[PDB]
């Protein structure tokens, strides 16, 4: 029973690992997109062309 | 000089139009990888479907019970990944 | 014997962290599963009877 | 398996650079092509019937 | 005797890495194989009876 | 039994080897194609003829 029981733990845990690994890239990818596409609009604020605080 | 900044600021923009470009590559890469995994699991379940497709004939129903009972575990995985793929689109 | 207590202490330590599924769902998964195999088979035993 | 991911990473890398044609044109090229072969043939099947 | 334990340790080490096939498939391969030889022979014993 | 049993291991393992060998070339071949045909389109990007960031 112990060898059968212990194997079940490993099988369940092993699946949970690769599942976690896949999600890691997705959240990281959204972060860079949420930072790269994020970090541009502010410098366009210095070139707002919509107020009187821009260089333009 | 304000004129001097006008060229540097636009230069720093160019670094992110490619940085964001790289980020999209990672996102789409995962979508392709997630898509492929779905085919393999259903293929295995599909194989068990053909395996179960060869037992219930000539009255061997008891064998079909166990065969399809095993398919159910694989079937659940297919549903979970199917919804995730649509969401990521 | 004290080792067994430590094992029991550790094994039950995360019976808290990850609580076992309640009987309600445990009373349904099998309850729906029996239909799942038979219902999906209901067409099997009829379409390719 | 990781090699396949690298292939998938590289293959899909320039699915961005060169986006695939939208279905609208894909819905027209064939749509006009069928007429193109038949319409150009429409005279063929009539002029030299 | 301790050598045998080391052999047993090593032999069973990769009973984990490559788990043996479950009885379900082991209950089918032979089950389908008997038909495979007879069914393919079913035509043999009839076509060239 | 031991000599019969041990031979079976070698026969099964030997088949698995050449099977692995065949797949190695196929994946490597797809990689070079996924790199050679891959490495051209970018330099065409410098000659895009579709934007205002190309030499053309």
- What is the SS3 assignment for F53? coil
* B44, B74 Cβ separation under 8 angstroms: yes
Residue B84: closest C-alpha in chain A: A23
DSSP-derived letter for residue B67 is: H
Residue C41 CB partners (closer than 8 Å, separation 6+): B64, B68
The SS3 assignment for B27 reads helix
Query: Please, which residues have CB within 8 angstroms of residue E2's CB and are 6 or more apart in sequence?
Result: none
Give C38 to chain B, closest Cα distance, Å: 9
Taking alpha carbons only, the member of E38, E36, E23, C42 closest to residue B61 is C42
Please say whether the beta carbons of B45 and B71 come within 8 A: yes
According to the entry, how was the structure determined?
Answer: cryo-EM
Judge whether B25 is closer than 8 Å to chain D, CB to CB. yes
Among D3, D7, D18, whose Cβ lies nearest the Cβ of F41?
D18
E29 interaction partners in chain B (CB closer than 8 Å): none
Resolution in A: 4.0
User: Measured on CA atoms in the order C23, C25, C27, C29, is the torsion positive or negative?
Assistant: negative
Contact E24 B70 (CB under 8 A): yes
CA distance E29 to B64: 14
For residue C41, which of B49, A3, E47 has the smallest C-alpha distance?
Answer: B49
Residue pair A54/A45 in contact by the 8 Å Cβ criterion:
yes
Cβ atoms of residues A47 and A54 within 8 Å:
yes
Of D4, F30, C21, nearest to B29 by C-alpha is D4
Q: How far is CA A52 from CA A45, A49, B3, B4, D20, in A?
A: 11, 8, 17, 19, 42
Report the alpha-carbon distance of residue E21 to residue E8 in Å, rounded.
20
DSSP chain E: -HHHHHHHHHHHHHHHHSPPPPHHHHHHHHHHHHHHHHHHHHHHHHHT-
- Å from D19 to nearest chain B CA? 13
């Amino acid at each position: 029973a112990l060898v059968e029981q212990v194997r079940g733990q490993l099988q369940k845990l092993e699946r949970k690992y690769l599942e976690l690994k896949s999600q890691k890239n997705l959240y990281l990818a959204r972060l860079k997109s949420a930072i790269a596409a994020q970090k541009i609009e502010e410098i366009a604020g210095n070139l707002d062309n919509a107020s009187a605080s821009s260089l333009f | 000089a304000p004129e001097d900044l006008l060229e540097r600021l636009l230069g720093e923009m160019e670094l992110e139009l490619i940085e964001l470009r790289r980020a999209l590559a990672q996102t789409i890469a995962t979508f392709k990888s997630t898509e492929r995994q779905r085919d393999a699991q259903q293929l295995i379940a599909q194989r068990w479907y053909e395996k179960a497709q060869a037992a219930l004939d000539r009255g061997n129903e008891q064998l079909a019970r166990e065969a399809l009972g095993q398919r159910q575990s694989y079937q659940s995985h297919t549903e979970a990944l199917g919804k995730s793929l649509g969401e990521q689109r | 014997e004290r080792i067994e207590t430590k094992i029991l202490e550790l094994e039950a330590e995360r019976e808290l962290l990850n609580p076992p599924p309640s009987p309600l769902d445990k009373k349904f998964e099998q309850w729906e599963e029996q239909q799942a195999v038979e219902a999906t088979l209901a067409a099997m035993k009829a379409r390719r009877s």
